[PDB]
């Protein structure tokens, strides 16, 4: 698994700073719709990511370099009672409420949220014109999972309006808390599927959470040319957009250790960036399918090494001459100026030819005759 | 035309290690043996070491300051002279040169091991420690 360590990386394109790992860091499967909670923060500044920032259908993922704390509570002192509904089954339901009923709500620091929106506007002005008024408004429609910030807290499921967070216009040049009303829903349908649902049983007592808003999901309205103002509304979109904010660094790469090269003898992933020659001397059920595949792959390589008359390891000289048509740099440069990856790209299209000539057609002349 | 393109080395802490390569094309690498020398920037060339001829021992002889510090190897299959330089001190620096040593001897004035000469050198590769 390669990971891009470039601090300003915005999801696509070259990454000069690459590292390799076997396992990703711990990713919390945090479920949230408009604001991404907990997760991992940017290092230097707020990072805006979009497949095409001008496209009105692709969701814009904002990653914050600082958290905005979002407290939330369910004031109700809620006593649960349970009854038996069948052999070995019990139905849990809210018994009653002792104190005042009150309303579930969330708190976001007003000055901190205003500063965060200022940073987001500063970044958005780079992708668009520097004289564009950036307007934040509430979600324009959809079901309750999309229009409201939906999340889990202490076992309950909160749905918060967030009309107070995105209510502003930003022209191109203390200690108060923004209180978001929140509703609680026990019948839950996450990853919206036709014909499935869950009953979340109520949790006894008062609930409180404390969490970091570390990302946003935004959507542009568009459709006008002369307006001069761009409206960014929150949008839940798809749940995958959550984990794109966590796996943006990683890319899975198959390892192909085998290679061929021209040389004057006739019978870890480090140093990938180092030129050839220097590298030569320098060098449940899912888990089962996974280990088995590797074993097969291992034997496959060995099988090739079996038929090429190379029972050894690492290096072996062979008796097929190098055709000049196989991209020839004369051997002074290939082993000095060119990396293994570039060389593989050079002879990828031709590779099956050399695999054909290095086949046991040669070793029938060499071993049987 | 014996091109000797040597390219490797760079900035490094006082303690460290690095790996210089000296390509070569246009002559017989397979028996003619090669040498490294160092020229610190405020100094002239100073001799480092030299692989011995394949069949002439295939061994290496380091220099007075460098003994125990560097190591020389040759992969004649790819015509490459590698030099591993490890356990670095601060005086280690300069445009480290790789050249093709020769064997010279004659009677009359004979005396073992005689003398060698550095005909075709490389261009150069800067290495500087900090």
């Amino acid at each position: 698994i390669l990971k891009c360590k470039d601090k300003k990386f915005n999801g696509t394109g070259p990454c000069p700073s690459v590292s390799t790992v076997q396992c990703t860091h711990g990713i919390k499967p945090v479920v949230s719709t408009q604001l991404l909670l907990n997760g991992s923060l940017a290092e230097e500044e707020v990072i805006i990511r979009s497949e095409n920032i001008t496209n009105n259908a692709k969701n814009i993922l904002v990653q914050l370099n600082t958290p905005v704390q979002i407290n939330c509570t369910r004031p109700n002192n809620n006593t649960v009672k349970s009854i038996r509904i069948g052999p070995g089954q019990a139905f849990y339901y809210t018994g009653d409420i002792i104190g005042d009923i009150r309303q579930a709500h969330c708190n976001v620091s007003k000055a901190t949220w205003n500063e965060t929106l200022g940073k987001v506007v500063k970044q958005l002005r780079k992708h668009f014109g520097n004289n564009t008024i950036i307007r934040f408004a509430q979600s324009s429609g959809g079901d309750l999972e999309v229009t409201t910030h939906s999340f889990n807290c202490g076992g309950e499921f909160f749905y918060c309006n967030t009309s107070g967070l995105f209510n502003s216009t930003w022209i191109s040049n203390s200690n108060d808390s923004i209180t978001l009303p929140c509703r609680i829903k026990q019948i839950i349908n996450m990853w919206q599927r036709i014909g499935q649902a869950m009953y979340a049983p109520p949790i006894q007592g008062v609930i409180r959470c404390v969490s970091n808003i570390t990302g946003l999901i935004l959507t542009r309205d568009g459709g006008s040319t002369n307006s001069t103002t761009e409206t960014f509304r929150p949008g839940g979109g798809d749940m995958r957009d959550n984990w794109r904010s966590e796996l943006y660094k990683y890319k899975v790469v198959k390892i192909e250790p085998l290679g061929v090269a021209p040389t004057r003898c006739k019978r870890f992933l480090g140093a990938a960036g180092s030129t050839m020659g220097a590298a030569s001397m320098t060098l449940g059920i899912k888990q089962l399918q996974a280990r088995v595949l590797a074993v097969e792959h291992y034997l496959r390589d060995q099988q090739l090494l079996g038929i090429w008359g190379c029972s050894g390891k690492l290096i072996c000289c062979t008796n097929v001459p190098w055709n000049s048509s196989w991209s020839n740099r004369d051997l002074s440069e290939i082993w000095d100026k060119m990396t293994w990856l570039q060389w593989d790209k050079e002879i990828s299209n031709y590779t099956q030819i050399i695999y054909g000539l290095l086949e046991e057609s040669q070793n029938q002349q060499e071993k049987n005759e | 035309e014996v091109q000797l393109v040597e390219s490797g080395g760079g900035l490094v802490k006082p303690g460290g290690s690095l790996r210089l390569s000296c390509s070569a094309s246009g002559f017989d690498f397979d028996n003619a043996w090669m040498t490294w020398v160092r020229q610190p920037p405020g100094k002239g060339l100073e001799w480092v070491g030299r692989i011995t001829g394949p069949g002439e021992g295939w061994s290496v002889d380091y220099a007075a300051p460098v003994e125990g510090r560097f190591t020389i190897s040759r992969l004649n299959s790819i015509n490459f002279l590698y030099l591993e330089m490890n356990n670095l001190r601060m005086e280690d620096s300069g445009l480290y040169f790789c050249a093709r040593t020769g064997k010279y001897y004659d009677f009359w004035s004979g005396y073992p091991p005689g003398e060698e000469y550095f005909q075709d050198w490389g261009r150069g590769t800067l290495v500087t420690v900090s």
């Binding site: 003898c265 | 001829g53 069949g55 002439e56 021992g57 009677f107 004979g110 073992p112 091991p113």
Partner: peptide, 26 residues
């Protein structure tokens, strides 16, 4: 047992000993 012994043509072997009795015999 690398390329060592792969190309074995040495009649002037051990030059740093061929010196040692090049002119010493003289």
């Amino acid at each position: 047992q690398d390329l060592l012994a792969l190309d074995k043509w040495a009649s002037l072997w051990n030059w740093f000993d061929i010196t040692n009795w090049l002119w010493y015999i003289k």
